[PDB]
Design an enzyme around this catalytic site. Structure first.
Site, PDB file in Angstrom:
ATOM      1  N   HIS A  61      -3.356   8.960  26.613  1.00 40.53           N
ATOM      2  CA  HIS A  61      -3.402   8.329  25.250  1.00 40.53           C
ATOM      3  C   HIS A  61      -2.995   9.365  24.223  1.00 40.53           C
ATOM      4  CE1 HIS A  61      -5.509   5.079  27.294  1.00 40.53           C
ATOM      5  NE2 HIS A  61      -6.477   5.932  27.718  1.00 40.53           N
ATOM      6  N   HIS A  91      -7.634  16.439  18.945  1.00 39.36           N
ATOM      7  CA  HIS A  91      -6.459  15.727  19.414  1.00 39.36           C
ATOM      8  C   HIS A  91      -5.776  15.181  18.192  1.00 39.36           C
ATOM      9  CE1 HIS A  91      -9.537  12.614  18.880  1.00 39.36           C
ATOM     10  NE2 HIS A  91      -8.474  11.897  18.411  1.00 39.36           N
ATOM     11  N   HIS A  93      -2.969  12.010  16.663  1.00 38.54           N
ATOM     12  CA  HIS A  93      -2.218  10.744  16.726  1.00 38.54           C
ATOM     13  C   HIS A  93      -0.913  10.866  15.998  1.00 38.54           C
ATOM     14  CE1 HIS A  93      -6.059   8.593  17.962  1.00 38.54           C
ATOM     15  NE2 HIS A  93      -6.568   9.632  17.257  1.00 38.54           N
ATOM     16  N   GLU A 103      -3.568   7.472  11.376  1.00 39.45           N
ATOM     17  CA  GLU A 103      -4.471   6.301  11.551  1.00 39.45           C
ATOM     18  C   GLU A 103      -5.035   5.924  10.169  1.00 39.45           C
ATOM     19  OE1 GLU A 103      -7.021   7.407  15.055  1.00 39.45           O
ATOM     20  OE2 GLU A 103      -5.569   5.875  15.826  1.00 39.45           O
ATOM     21  N   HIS A 116      -7.673  15.087  14.619  1.00 43.38           N
ATOM     22  CA  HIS A 116      -9.084  14.732  14.703  1.00 43.38           C
ATOM     23  C   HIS A 116      -9.814  15.844  15.373  1.00 43.38           C
ATOM     24  CE1 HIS A 116      -8.064  10.192  14.124  1.00 43.38           C
ATOM     25  NE2 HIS A 116      -8.080  10.923  12.989  1.00 43.38           N
ATOM     26  N   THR A 195     -11.675   5.544  16.917  1.00 38.46           N
ATOM     27  CA  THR A 195     -10.485   4.723  16.732  1.00 38.46           C
ATOM     28  C   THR A 195      -9.807   4.327  18.064  1.00 38.46           C
ATOM     29  OG1 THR A 195      -8.853   6.556  16.641  1.00 38.46           O
ATOM     30  CG2 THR A 195     -10.112   5.965  14.552  1.00 38.46           C
TER      31      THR A 195
HETATM   32  N1  LIG Z   1      -9.756   9.019  17.598  1.00 37.61           N
HETATM   33  S1  LIG Z   1     -11.362   9.500  17.478  1.00 37.61           S
HETATM   34  O1  LIG Z   1     -11.528  10.870  16.907  1.00 37.61           O
HETATM   35  O2  LIG Z   1     -12.059   8.449  16.685  1.00 37.61           O
HETATM   36  C1  LIG Z   1     -11.914   9.505  19.122  1.00 37.61           C
HETATM   37  C2  LIG Z   1     -11.662   8.496  20.092  1.00 37.61           C
HETATM   38  C3  LIG Z   1     -12.311   8.882  21.302  1.00 37.61           C
HETATM   39  C4  LIG Z   1     -12.946  10.077  21.107  1.00 37.61           C
HETATM   40  S2  LIG Z   1     -13.870  10.796  22.419  1.00 37.61           S
HETATM   41  O3  LIG Z   1     -12.814  11.219  23.457  1.00 37.61           O
HETATM   42  O4  LIG Z   1     -14.490  12.055  21.942  1.00 37.61           O
HETATM   43  C5  LIG Z   1     -14.974   9.632  23.225  1.00 37.61           C
HETATM   44  C6  LIG Z   1     -16.200   9.300  22.650  1.00 37.61           C
HETATM   45  C7  LIG Z   1     -17.028   8.352  23.342  1.00 37.61           C
HETATM   46  C8  LIG Z   1     -16.596   7.774  24.541  1.00 37.61           C
HETATM   47  C9  LIG Z   1     -15.342   8.103  25.086  1.00 37.61           C
HETATM   48  C10 LIG Z   1     -14.530   9.041  24.417  1.00 37.61           C
HETATM   49  S3  LIG Z   1     -12.917  10.711  19.632  1.00 37.61           S
HETATM   50 ZN   LIG Z   2      -8.420  10.404  17.102  1.00 36.86          ZN
END
Ligand SMILES: NS(=O)(=O)c1ccc(S(=O)(=O)c2ccccc2)s1
Ligand SMILES: [Zn+2]
Length: 257
Positions: A61, A91, A93, A103, A116, A195
């Site tokens: 992803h 990470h 996007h 986003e 993020h 997200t």
């Molecule tokens: N894009 S974001 O910063 O909002 C985000 C999406 C997923 C994560 S997590 O990989 O930390 C995670 C957290 C809980 C369950 C699975 C993965 S953080």
């Molecule tokens: Zn993110």
């Protein structure tokens, strides 16, 4: 089953994760005119001096730079937060073109990419418990625009060719995330969610007003990654962003002006 295409993309997520249509989903458009200045907000405290990165991973992803979060190192606190949140990973996007990829948007403006930095609340003992609480995570979001290169990003861009496909990993030690921060820590903040699936409503979002500049060559290298695993039809990793979701009852607060 989830991803970012026509058949499994954001429009489809609600079928596996009904929370997708919840009351505090992210990202959102930040309407800079209806965001409330809040003089009781503290400066954000970002203490990354002792951050220890471990690895970098293509998870199909995005790519994630992971940190050793077993000790009290790399903490976010202050701002809107009532506790100490510990860095676990960052990470990005990004888009297929420089005119999209972020986003969050700012008065409907889409930036080229969004970083993020994910932190969990130390009151819950670890990340896995923290994500099941309404104040479990704090995610610091930083917009990227294309312009001058960001020197501190280059180590990341250089290792990407070693993690091209979904499931690949690389040792990634001694990466300093202070090199990804803009000058100002002025921010907007609001309560929302992950997200991506599982879309958990556990995030306090802190989005910096000041974007960082990255070069077109840097973001082009993000776009050479793949969604697919090694030995499947090539699907470039681009447009891995969720569009703005309904603000619903929520207020976005500003730390500035
Ligand atoms: N894009 S974001 O910063 O909002 C985000 C999406 C997923 C994560 S997590 O990989 O930390 C995670 C957290 C809980 C369950 C699975 C993965 S953080
Ligand atoms: Zn993110």
């Amino acid at each position: 089953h989830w991803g970012y295409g026509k058949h499994n993309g954001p429009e489809h997520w609600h079928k596996d994760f009904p929370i997708a249509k919840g009351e505090r989903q992210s990202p959102v458009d930040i309407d800079t005119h209806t965001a409330k200045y809040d003089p009781s907000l503290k400066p954000l405290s970002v203490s990354y001096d002792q951050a220890t990165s471990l690895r970098i991973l293509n998870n199909g992803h995005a790519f994630n730079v992971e940190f050793d979060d077993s000790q009290d190192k790399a903490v976010l606190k202050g701002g809107p937060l009532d506790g100490t949140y510990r860095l676990i990973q960052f990470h990005f996007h990004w888009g297929s073109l420089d005119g999209q990829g972020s986003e969050h948007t700012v008065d409907k403006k889409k930036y080229a990419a969004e970083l993020h930095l994910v932190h969990w609340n130390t009151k819950y003992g670890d990340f896995g418990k923290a994500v099941q609480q309404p104040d479990g995570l704090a995610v610091l979001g930083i917009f990227l625009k294309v312009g001058s290169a960001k020197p501190g990003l280059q180590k990341v861009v250089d290792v990407l060719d070693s993690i091209k496909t979904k499931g690949k990993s690389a040792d990634f030690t001694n990466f300093d995330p202070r090199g990804l921060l803009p000058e100002s820590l002025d921010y907007w903040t609001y309560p929302g969610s992950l997200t991506t699936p599982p879309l958990l409503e556990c995030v306090t979002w802190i989005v910096l007003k000041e974007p960082i500049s990255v070069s077109s060559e840097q973001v082009l290298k993000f776009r050479k990654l793949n969604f697919n695993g090694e030995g499947e039809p090539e699907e470039l990793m681009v447009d891995n962003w969720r569009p703005a979701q309904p603000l619903k009852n929520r207020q976005i607060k500003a730390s500035f002006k």
